[PDB]
């Protein structure tokens, strides 16, 4: 409903927590030509030694991919300089961070959300090897715990410089002033916001286990890697326009004059297969690098500080963000501010009093049908219009839609 003098201002809010999963790295792999293409045959080694120098390019590309994958996890979780630890007394002003904080009872210091995520998502004969990542699971968990402790205890200060302690209610008040709502709203409604936060955390904890499709990106990544490896292994056992797939049959059946042609054809086939594999791996590595850059930027602008960007760190007005480790990825818990109940009123651009036009100073004029008040845009907090809530500029005739009312003078 659109009208020239109608405005809808919320009277209540709901705290909502959303989850976003972003891939970070993919599995590191290496290929050995001699063990793969023929499998330690002297004739194949002699022929391929004189057949180009592709294997150097293959190995260099694979090593570069592995180095980039190591850098991907390095540039996302290691944005903190020190390993912050939470105080032993975990009060935090009525907020329950148990589901995100590490659990000392479990043998592995991993949060329940991380445990659920890791439970949901869990040398080949041809010379395929999978290299281990430089950063282990425990190291990424420690980095995530340090980031959580920093954002809980100090706020955004540990990203700009030295960590500065601040009570959590004061930090939430600062976030509220960041989104536009005044600090009073939080201080008067602390218990309700704490209860909403705890309920949202519990609900997302249940949801992460209820629907198994949330981990689709990481499942697709691991499935693609497995499919590529299995396709290569299966494609090795192919005729490729030869008498037999097994090199032993050719080398023991026929004389060298045509065995050379057969092994050359097999060499060409396996080289083409390896080239296709590494081309697809390079494309997938580029996509994963883009995803990792996005994840790092989201970490920087949502966990290390409040973001004014719309729909970037969640759906709504951003307050906080908590990171969680995941297999080959990171999970972001986005806390947002959403208006709940809308009530419409009558509004005017300005107020005419003693031939002086009064404009609202960080607010909007609101009328319930018999009196006019001033209140903030994102919350209904009526106030008596005085000379400190409004400022005077210009005359009364210029403004269109100006209404007449009396403004109180404190003095």
């Amino acid at each position: 409903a659109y009208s020239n003098n109608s405005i809808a201002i919320p009277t209540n809010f709901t705290i909502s927590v959303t989850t976003e999963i972003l891939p970070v790295s993919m599995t590191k792999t290496s290929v050995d030509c001699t063990m793969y293409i023929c499998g330690d045959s002297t004739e194949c080694s002699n022929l391929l030694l004189q057949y180009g120098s592709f294997c150097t390019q293959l190995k260099r590309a694979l090593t570069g991919i592995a180095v980039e994958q190591d850098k991907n996890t390095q540039e996302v979780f290691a944005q903190v300089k020190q390993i912050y630890k939470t105080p032993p007394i975990k009060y935090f002003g009525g907020f329950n961070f148990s589901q995100i904080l590490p659990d000392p009872s479990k043998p592995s210091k991993r949060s329940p959300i991380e445990d659920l995520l890791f439970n949901k998502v869990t040398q080949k004969f041809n010379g395929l090897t999978v290299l281990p990542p430089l950063l282990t699971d425990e190291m990424i968990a420690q980095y995530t715990s340090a980031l959580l402790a920093g954002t809980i205890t100090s706020g955004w200060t540990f990203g700009a410089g030295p960590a500065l302690q601040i009570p959590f209610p004061m930090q939430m008040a600062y976030r509220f002033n960041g989104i536009g709502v005044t600090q009073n709203v939080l201080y008067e409604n602390q218990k309700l916001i704490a209860n909403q936060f705890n309920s949202a955390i519990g609900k997302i904890q249940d949801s992460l286990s209820s629907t198994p499709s949330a981990l689709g990106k990481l499942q697709d990544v691991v499935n693609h890697n497995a499919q590529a490896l299995n396709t290569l292994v299966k494609q090795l056992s192919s005729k490729f326009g030869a008498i037999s797939s097994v090199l032993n049959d050719i080398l023991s059946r026929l004389d060298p004059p045509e065995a050379e042609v057969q092994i050359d054809r097999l060499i060409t086939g396996r080289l083409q297969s390896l080239q296709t594999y590494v081309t697809q791996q390079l494309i997938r590595a580029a996509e994963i690098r883009a995803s990792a850059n996005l994840a790092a930027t989201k970490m920087s602008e949502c966990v290390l500080g409040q973001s004014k960007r719309v729909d970037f760190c969640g759906k709504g007005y951003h307050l906080m963000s908590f990171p969680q480790s995941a297999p080959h990825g990171v999970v972001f818990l986005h806390v947002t501010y959403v208006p709940a109940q809308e009530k419409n009123f009558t509004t005017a651009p300005a107020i005419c009093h003693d031939g002086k036009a009064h404009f609202p100073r960080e607010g909007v004029f609101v009328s319930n049908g018999t009196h006019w008040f001033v209140t903030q845009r994102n919350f209904y907090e009526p106030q008596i219009i005085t000379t400190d809530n409004t400022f005077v500029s210009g005359n009364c005739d210029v403004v269109i839609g100006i209404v007449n009312n009396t403004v109180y003078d404190p003095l």
Binding site: M35, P132, G150
Partner: protein, 115 residues
């Protein structure tokens, strides 16, 4: 009773029954893999450390250390943790530090601070 061979998901022979006696045995490829050399700057020193990727040390300096990434020869383990410069793999790093030798150790994330 009638089967003789065995074959895994990737169409590779896994287990074979010998035709003489009624016994079945697996077929696992004997250890292979790549090799790596860990060294500081050639001006800094000349000692080198050799890492065998993905092979147990039984299959393979007189110092032998079993890392999750593989077998490390020429470097000694230390009960410490430093900001590492040469990443070996699986949380293990090497460096040239003291009389001087290459030392393998677990990474240190950073100084522990409790606000």
């Amino acid at each position: 009773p009638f089967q003789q061979f065995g074959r895994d998901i990737a169409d590779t022979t896994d287990a074979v029954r010998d035709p003489q006696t009624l016994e079945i045995l697996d077929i696992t490829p004997c250890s292979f893999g790549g090799v790596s050399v860990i060294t500081p700057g050639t001006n800094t020193s000349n000692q080198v450390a050799v890492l065998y990727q993905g092979v147990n040390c039984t299959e393979v300096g007189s110092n032998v250390f079993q890392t999750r990434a593989g077998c490390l020869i020429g470097a000694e383990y230390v009960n410490n943790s430093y900001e590492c410069d040469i990443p070996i793999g699986a949380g293990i790093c090497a460096s040239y530090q003291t009389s001087q030798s290459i030392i393998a150790y677990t990474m240190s994330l950073g100084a522990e601070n409790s606000v």
